[PDB]
From a paper:
UspCNt crystallized in two different crystal lattices. The tetragonal crystal form (space group P41) contained one copy of UspCNt in the crystallographic asymmetric unit (ASU), whereas the monoclinic crystal form (space group P21) contained two copies. An initial model of UspC was generated using ARP/wARP, extended manually (COOT) and used to determine a molecular replacement solution for the monoclinic crystal form (PHASER). An improved experimental density map could be generated by multi-crystal averaging (DMMULTI), which allowed to build and refine (REFMAC5, PHENIX.REFINE) a complete structural model. The conformational flexibility of UspCNt revealed by the comparison of the monoclinic to the tetragonal crystal form highlights the potential for structural plasticity between the two domains, which may be functionally significant in ligand binding and is comparable to previously reported carbohydrate-binding domains of ABC transporters, which undergo an opening/closing motion upon ligand binding, exemplified by the structures of GacH.
The uspC gene forms part of a putative three-gene operon, uspABC, of which uspA and uspB encode the membrane-spanning subunits of the transporter, while uspC is a homologue of ABC transporter-linked solute-binding proteins. The fold of UspCNt follows the architecture of periplasmic binding proteins for bacterial ABC transporters, consisting of two subdomains or lobes that enclose the putative carbohydrate-binding cleft in the centre of the molecule. In conclusion, our data strongly indicate that Mtb-UspC is a carbohydrate-binding unit of the essential UspABC transporter system, with a substrate preference for sugars containing an amino group at the C2 or C3 position.
Numbering used by the authors: 39 to 438
Write the structure that this text describes.
Amino acid sequence: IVVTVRLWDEPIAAAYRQSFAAFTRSHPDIEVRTNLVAYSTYFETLRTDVAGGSADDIFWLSNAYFAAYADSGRLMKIQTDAADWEPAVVDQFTRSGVLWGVPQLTDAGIAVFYNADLLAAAGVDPTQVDNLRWSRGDDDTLRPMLARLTVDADGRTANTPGFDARRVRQWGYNAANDPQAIYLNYIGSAGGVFQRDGKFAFDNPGAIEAFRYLVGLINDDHVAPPASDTNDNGDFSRNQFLAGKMALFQSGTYSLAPVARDALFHWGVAMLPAGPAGRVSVTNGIAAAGNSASKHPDAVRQVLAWMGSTEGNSYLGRHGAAIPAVLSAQPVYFDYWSARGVDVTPFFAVLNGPRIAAPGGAGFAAGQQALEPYFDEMFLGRGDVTTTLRQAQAAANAAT
């Protein structure tokens, strides 16, 4: 009996092959085969295959797309215990009171890389960075911390008279037109939404609050790089962090590999700052769904059970590049990194409260491209956040 597993990441396909070889040794009635399809056309192809009965037994879904499949009965109900799976990914795949996929991988949450040498030089202990709060009111603690951490070529900090924003040598932070690392967390941390019911919905009080704050950090405080540096250069801030030029660099686990490889100074990871509604990180996960039209539904059930076990899911995290969604399997990931001198807890701890889903779905790419020029102007400090969001929303939706 052959069960086929469909997915889109190659290194993970390698890890699956190692996982399923271990499965078949304890369950030799079943051979599992992986089937790579490139990310760029995965969903358009899965849509055709599912629709006409030739999709694989097991396939990867994201949050963006599973809904259409779940409603039309394409997907098996995941009828197991869920206490050992990331709650974030579990919620991501629950619809009408049913779990529709076995959680496989998670992004985890956003955190704050810091350059400890640059903290030491400014008189800041790394623990201080874990208790920061952003706000439009006078309960804010982020801004003065970023100000202390932003230095011009004369040694004048951002809050000092004389400070020259043209001559900044060291930025405190990476506030920028950068959804995943920055503004999606600000919106959620303000109680706003970015997307609702497959439509862009960021024209709302919370998002207004978030964008005013960010606009201010960049154009008025000068504690993050100018928007011309970062609008359409997604890597600018990370490169400045690597060059020893940025105190705090707010990002996800995707920057762990690029940071560990090249960073020559002492560094760590601290918590996401809290907003008016707490520390709310963007997150996103991947689940493996069972095909309801599978020729061998029992064997699929055995394979899904293994994929969701400590032992099976451990394989995806053993290389420290993808994070297991099984909670008991995640120490393979922590260990990978602790041995390389990095504590990864803040990326995980942040999930322990409320969250915002990574936006996605049909017509999203096109919508995201359409809002882009308006967001660029907004981060350039031009016009008004209010008027910009209203026009950007109408434009994003039209394109969708």
